[PDB]
Amino acid sequence: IVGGTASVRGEWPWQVTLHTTSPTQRHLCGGSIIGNQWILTAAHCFYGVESPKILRVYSGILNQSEIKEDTSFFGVQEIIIHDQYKMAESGYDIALLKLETTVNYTDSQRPISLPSKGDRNVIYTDCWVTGWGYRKLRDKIQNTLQKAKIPLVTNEECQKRYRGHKITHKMICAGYREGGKDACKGDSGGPLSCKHNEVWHLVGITSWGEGCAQRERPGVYTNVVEYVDWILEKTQA
């Protein structure tokens, strides 16, 4: 997260850090708890992933330094990638992880609601991107989960910034026209969370952008509301 600030324990209880154990253990991507055994994340995260056996989902984590040998985690039973996915910039950048066990909800780990299909005409004005990603293009993963408040940008304005890419209605953009705050490397897969009527909704999944927090180059997120039926279909299978 560029221009982010530290989060506190229990602030983003749906946020997870997804690690790969091959060849060595490291943070791969963010994700969000959406159900008892389900994490919603980005399909692009699994490009170099051999099988679900090499993945570990860590919930209730504020600091990466808290992740050691005896740290509790959730194994992954299945990786479900949208069957139309090809590349982040062409959309369908969405995946589910079916966990090996159910998740007992606590203050440190609980699901975020999906956006309401009735809330299509909803104007979200309290949106936040979170993650352990870089603070600039050439950086390193951050120890403490970071957050940044970012405004949504219309699809029409976003399309003007990205003449070489198709910005579809299945994408949502966010960022400051004057730059400065945005997701960056290591944040993808995590949530763009909007608080509406005192309830948090998972509005976007961090997907891609041209550079990090550059002027007139908003971040591009998967528009979760456009995938509600796909998510319900796959989570009941």
Ligand X SMILES: COC(=O)Nc1ccc(-c2ccnc([C@H](Cc3ccccc3)NC(=O)/C=C/c3cc(Cl)ccc3-n3cnnn3)c2)cc1
Ligand Y SMILES: *[C@@H]1O[C@H](CO)[C@@H](O)[C@H](O)[C@H]1NC(C)=O
d(CA 26, CA 6): 20
Is residue 188 annotated as a catalytic residue, yes or no? yes
User: Nearest-CB residue to ligand Y?
Assistant: 104
- Is 154 near ligand Y (CB under 6 A)? no
Chain breaks in the chain (C to N over 2.5 A) after: none
Q: Which of ligand Y, ligand X, none does residue 186 bind (CB under 5 to 8 Å by kind)?
A: ligand X
- Is 236 near ligand Y (CB under 6 A)? no
Is residue 70 annotated as a catalytic residue, yes or no? no
d(CA 130, CA 149): 9
Q: What DSSP assignment string belongs to 132-176?
A: S--SSSS----SBPEEEE--EE-HHHHHHH-TTS---TTEEEE--
Nearer to ligand Y, 101 or 143 (CB): 101
User: Which residues of this chain interact with ligand X, rule CB under 6 A?
Assistant: 26-29, 44-45, 47, 133, 141, 182-188, 206-209, 211-212, 219-221
Residue count (the chain): 237
- Is 5 near ligand Y (CB under 6 A)? no
Nearer to ligand X, 121 or 133 (CB): 133
CA distances from 103 to 68, 106, 136, 153 (A): 20, 9, 34, 34
The correct pick among 5, 84, 102, 143 for binding ligand Y (CB under 6 A) is 102
Q: Which residues contribute to the site for ligand Y (CB under 6 A)?
A: 101-102, 104
Known binding residues for heparin: 160-163
